[PDB]
Amino acid sequence: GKPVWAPHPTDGFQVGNIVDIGPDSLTIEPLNQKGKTFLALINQVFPAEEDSKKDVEDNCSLMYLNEATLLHNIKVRYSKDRIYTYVANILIAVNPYFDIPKIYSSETIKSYQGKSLGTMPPHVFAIADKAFRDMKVLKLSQSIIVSGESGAGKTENTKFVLRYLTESYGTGQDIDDRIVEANPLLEAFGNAKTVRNNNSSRFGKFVEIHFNEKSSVVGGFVSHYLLEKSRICVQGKEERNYHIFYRLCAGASEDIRERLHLSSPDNFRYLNRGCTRYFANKETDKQILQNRKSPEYLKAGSLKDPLLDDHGDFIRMCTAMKKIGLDDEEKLDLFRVVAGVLHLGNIDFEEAGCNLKNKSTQALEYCAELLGLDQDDLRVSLTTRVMLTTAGGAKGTVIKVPLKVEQANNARDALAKTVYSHLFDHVVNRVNQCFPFETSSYFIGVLDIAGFEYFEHNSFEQFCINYCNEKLQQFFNERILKEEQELYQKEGLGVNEVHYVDNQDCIDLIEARLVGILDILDEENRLPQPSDQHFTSAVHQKHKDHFRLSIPRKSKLAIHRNIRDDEGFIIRHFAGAVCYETTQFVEKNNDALHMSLESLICESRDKFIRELFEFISVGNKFKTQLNLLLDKLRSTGASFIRCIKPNLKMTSHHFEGAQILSQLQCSGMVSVLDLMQGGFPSRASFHELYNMYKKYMPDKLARLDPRLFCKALFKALGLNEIDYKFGLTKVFFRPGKFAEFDQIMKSDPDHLAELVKRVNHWLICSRWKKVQWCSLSVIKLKNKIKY
Amino acid sequence: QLTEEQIAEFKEAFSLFDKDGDGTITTKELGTVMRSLGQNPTEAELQDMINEVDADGNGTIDFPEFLTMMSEEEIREAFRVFDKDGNGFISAAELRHVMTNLGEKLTDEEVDEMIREADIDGDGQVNYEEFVTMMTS
Numbered sequence: 027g028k029p030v031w032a033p034h035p036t037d038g039f040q041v042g043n044i045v046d047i048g049p050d051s052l053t054i055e056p057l058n059q060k061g062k063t064f065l066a067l068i069n070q071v072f073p074a075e076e077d078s079k080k081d082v083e084d085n086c087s088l089m090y091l092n093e094a095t096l097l098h099n100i101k102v103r104y105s106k107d108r109i110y111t112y113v114a115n116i117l118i119a120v121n122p123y124f125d126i127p128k129i130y131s132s133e134t135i136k137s138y139q140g141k142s143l144g145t146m147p148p149h150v151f152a153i154a155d156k157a158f159r160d161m162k163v164l165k166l167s168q169s170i171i172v173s174g175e176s177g178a179g180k181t182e183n184t185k186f187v188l189r190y191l192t193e194s195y196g197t198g199q200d201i202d203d204r205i206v207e208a209n210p211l212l213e214a215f216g217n218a219k220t221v222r223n224n225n226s227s228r229f230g231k232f233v234e235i236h237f238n239e240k241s242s243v244v245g246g247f248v249s250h251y252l253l254e255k256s257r258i259c260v261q262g263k264e265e266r267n268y269h270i271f272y273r274l275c276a277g278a279s280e281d282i283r284e285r286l287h288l289s290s291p292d293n294f295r296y297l298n299r300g301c302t303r304y305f306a307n308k309e310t311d312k313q314i315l316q317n318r319k320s321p322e323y324l325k326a327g328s329l330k331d332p333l334l335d336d337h338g339d340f341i342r343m344c345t346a347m348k349k350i351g352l353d354d355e356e357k358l359d360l361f362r363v364v365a366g367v368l369h370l371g372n373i374d375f376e377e378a379g380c381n382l383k384n385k386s387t388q389a390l391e392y393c394a395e396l397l398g399l400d401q402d403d404l405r406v407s408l409t410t411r412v413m414l415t416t417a418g419g420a421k422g423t424v425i426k427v428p429l430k431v432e433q434a435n436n437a438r439d440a441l442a443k444t445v446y447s448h449l450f451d452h453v454v455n456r457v458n459q460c461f462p463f464e465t466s467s468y469f470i471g472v473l474d475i476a477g478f479e480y481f482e483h484n485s486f487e488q489f490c491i492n493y494c495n496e497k498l499q500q501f502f503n504e505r506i507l508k509e510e511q512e513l514y515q516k517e518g519l520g521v522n523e524v525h526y527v528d529n530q531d532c533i534d535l536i537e538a539r540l541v542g543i544l545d546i547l548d549e550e551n552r553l554p555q556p557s558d559q560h561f562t563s564a565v566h567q568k569h570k571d572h573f574r575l576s577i578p579r580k581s582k583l584a585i586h587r588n589i590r591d592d593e594g595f596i597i598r599h600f601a602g603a604v605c606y607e608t609t610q611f612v613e614k615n616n617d618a619l620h621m622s623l624e625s626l627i628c629e630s631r632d633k634f635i636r637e638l639f640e641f642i643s644v645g646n647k648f649k650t651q652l653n654l655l656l657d658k659l660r661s662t663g664a665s666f667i668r669c670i671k672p673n674l675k676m677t678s679h680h681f682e683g684a685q686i687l688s689q690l691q692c693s694g695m696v697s698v699l700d701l702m703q704g705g706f707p708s709r710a711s712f713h714e715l716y717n718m719y720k721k722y723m724p725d726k727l728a729r730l731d732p733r734l735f736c737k738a739l740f741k742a743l744g745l746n747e748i749d750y751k752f753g754l755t756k757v758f759f760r761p762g763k764f765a766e767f768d769q770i771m772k773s774d775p776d777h778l779a780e781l782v783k784r785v786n787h788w789l790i791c792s793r794w795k796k797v798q799w800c801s802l803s804v805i806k807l808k809n810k811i812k813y
Numbered sequence: 814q815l816t817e818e819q820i821a822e823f824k825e826a827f828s829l830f831d832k833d834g835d836g837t838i839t840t841k842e843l844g845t846v847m848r849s850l851g852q853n854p855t856e857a858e859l860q861d862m863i864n865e866v867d868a869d870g871n872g873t874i875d876f877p878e879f880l881t882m883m884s885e886e887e888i889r890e891a892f893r894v895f896d897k898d899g900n901g902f903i904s905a906a907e908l909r910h911v912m913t914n915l916g917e918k919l920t921d922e923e924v925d926e927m928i929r930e931a932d933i934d935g936d937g938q939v940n941y942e943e944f945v946t947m948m949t950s
């Protein structure tokens with residue numbers, strides 16, 4: 027009849043008591059109301075730490091390690107401004123939204139150098155230093171894999187790692203300051219407003235500090251992956267294309283506006299299906315000319331953000347270009363390509379196969395001028411493609427094949443995605459030229475990529491992101507599994523397999539060859555009449571009894587109920603079931619650029635464009651690039667940081683429980699807690715156990731060193747050798763067993779006193795033997811010096 | 814090379830070296846215990862003895878490494894560290910000297926009790942043969 031955590035809509039969990047039981051449910055009486063009893067599913071009720079004011083630096087010190095006790099432990103620590111907490115070697119980091127004094131000072135930096143994780147308070151610096159020490163000693167490059175929502179403190183977190191590593195282990199070159207100066211450039215081309223986040227990174231970013239043989243910093247390198255190409259051409263409402271487009275439209279001089287033929291964003295297909303409004307405040311709104319503002323901007327006003335501002339960010343972006351060496355010519359070259367892409371998107375077509383509409387004539391002219399193409403060549407390559415008359419070896423002829431209207435749209439957009447992506451590659455390579463190096467032995471890299479996410483409606487974009495994260499979560503789990511097994515061997519716990527339920531089957535469901543969802547989607551393209559519904563039935567037919575696939579009717583939510591079996595599927599991901607509506611999956615799986623048109627852009631009049639450039643589906647290109655990311659991570663040692671956004675209002679000292687619970691789930695932390703339940707999830711140093719329980723022992727035992735105190739106590743109590751493991755530095759416990767040990771220390775003092783009296787012989791022996799074998803050890807060390 | 818019994822016994826010895834309890838002996842710590850038990854090895858003899866066994870190369874000695882780093886004359890010279898004046902016998906005042914040099918905290922009641930449980934013949938002190946019998950249980 028002890029306290030438990032039970033669900034609460036805004037705090038995540040609340041403390042309560044179990045007053046009745048049910049078939050799959052428990053009846054909970056909250057402490058904080060007493061008679062608004064409610065039902066909770068059994069797997070949503072968790073045991074609670076007795077001491078509600080206790081906080082621990084490592085959550086493994088808890089007697090029950092579960093998502094509710096983790097949530098509460100980090101709440102209590104957040105209230106005392108301790109934003110950092112471990113789960114073993116994993117770092118949880120809650121954004122304070124204010125500048126914490128002293129924890130990032132040069133003196134603190136110094137105090138973390140060389141120190142083991144566990145001998146200092148939790149900190150991003152301890153993660154950086156662990157990466158450093160393993161790199162130096164094991165001769166192995168390192169990864170630091172950060173999860174979290176956009177704006178969850180990840181940007182700041184990366185800065186702390188780079189600053190720590192350069193100031194501690196570098197020689198005067200301020201590499202981390204050069205990456206920060208480049209940032210406004212990267213964000214302009216690679217970030218965008220989403221439904222939930224004004225400044226969301228739409229690419230996987232891996233920032234490397236490179237080291238020589240002497241483990242000293244030599245340079246930097248930004249690896250980039252998986253830029254989200256679909257955003258370039260279309261966006262949902264409440265979302266925008268990449269920031270660059272809006273910064274250019276709002277901030278460019280009238281002179282550049284006329285040279286690139288820009289106008290308000292509502293005039294461009296590639297902007298005007300999404301949100302066409304600027305981030306501005308009262309002052310910056312006055313600096314944007316009226317001819318840059320869309321009808322919806324003039325009507326509903328500007329978008330609001332405490333940092334983002336398109337006019338101001340334009341200036342700041344041009345300043346960042348100057349600092350990375352970009353002259354005014356290369357800057358206008360970038361803008362010219364951007365405007366080229368915008369005008370490209372306004373070209374329409376009509377059933378003649380097809381033809382440029384007459385209204386689209388000036389878009390063509392402007393696009394062609396800006397991308398350095400002949401108007402006529404462009405017109406033809408958009409409406410026609412070449413083809414060989416044969417396929418399998420025999421001598422063939424070139425023929426001209428006209429495109430239908432929908433195929434012309436596709437080539438137009440394909441060309442846009444290719445130009446924009448190549449421009450992005452150029453921008454990143456340009457950043458990397460600000461801190462180059464000829465050679466390196468190893469690197470420490472920090473990864474930032476969009477996390478697992480779901481909405482009411484989930485399309486192909488979500489499917490890809492959640493697939494990316496399913497694979498990253500398997501990587502997270504493999505490495506924690508390995509770290510734990512190694513900890514247990516290192517500590518002398520003996521033979522211990524930990525029960526691991528792999529998520530390989532979900533991964534196979536998505537990506538396996540021929541039978542995976544992606545290959546079945548590819549197969550749909552090949553049929554005479556490709557259909558989203560045929561693709562979806564084929565998935566359900568081939569994986570009829572797959573553990574991780576269900577039809578939409580089986581959903582636990584209401585709103586998915588009327589979705590037909592052929593309109594969607596559910597996937598049981600690591601973080602939870604997601605229902606995907608499959609409408610448009612087939613078209614979103616295609617963005618190939620046919621060859622005459624690609625060859626055309628490669629031989630643009632303009633040299634900058636030619637330099638940018640010098641039959642696979644979107645799904646499989648995604649898989650391929652994802653696998654290169656994983657190849658890189660798999661070749662390194664891995665450490666993990668979980669950044670948490672405490673609320674949606676950027677306010678300090680406001681812990682929003684359910685929002686944080688949600689992020690703990692989506693970031694894979696809960697899945698890792700389940701995994702650790704198969705091992706020894708609770709552990710405590712002899713020093714912690716000594717301080718907790720010495721008050722219950724005779725002064726005799728209270729005078730022992732912590733390790734012998736614990737040995738005596740554990741022997742005295744006659745503890746079951748399966749559940750309790752006496753390691754080198756800590757006592758390890760199977761699930762629930764630290765709580766059970768605690769009850770023995772509290773429930774029957776007369777029993778405990780007799781058991782202690784009876785261990786007196788064994789203890790006096792162990793205390794002789796200890797010192798005896800220690801003098802014998804000091805003798806053998808003298809003899810080895812004598813060799 | 815070593816029996817199960819003796820590996821366990823050296824594990825308890827190891828914690829005597831490893832005071833902070835971090836599962837590892839530094840150079841500083843290794844010196845503290847040898848010098849406290851009447852020895853004068855030097856900063857280069859320690860460091861060079863450590864480097865010849867530091868397999869993982871992390872500047873530090875874990876328990877496995879301590880084992881390799883490690884002949885009744887050793888046992889007899891072990892006894893002679895407790896036997897300051899060397900009458901072949903360890904008193905309560907002499908055990909108290911090695912205990913407190915080692916870092917062990919106790920009152921003389923406690924010291925006297927230890928000496929009694931090991932003292933088989935009842936003369937108030939601990940001879941060499943009774944010293945070995947403990948080690949081996």
Ligand SMILES: [Ca+2]
Pocket residue numbers: 831832833834835836837838839842
């Ligand atoms: Ca130590």
Ligand SMILES: [Ca+2]
Pocket residue numbers: 867868869870871872873874875878
């Ligand atoms: Ca070592």
Ligand SMILES: [Ca+2]
Pocket residue numbers: 895896897898899900901902903904907
């Ligand atoms: Ca003597």
Ligand SMILES: [Ca+2]
Pocket residue numbers: 932933934935936937938939940943
């Ligand atoms: Ca005697």
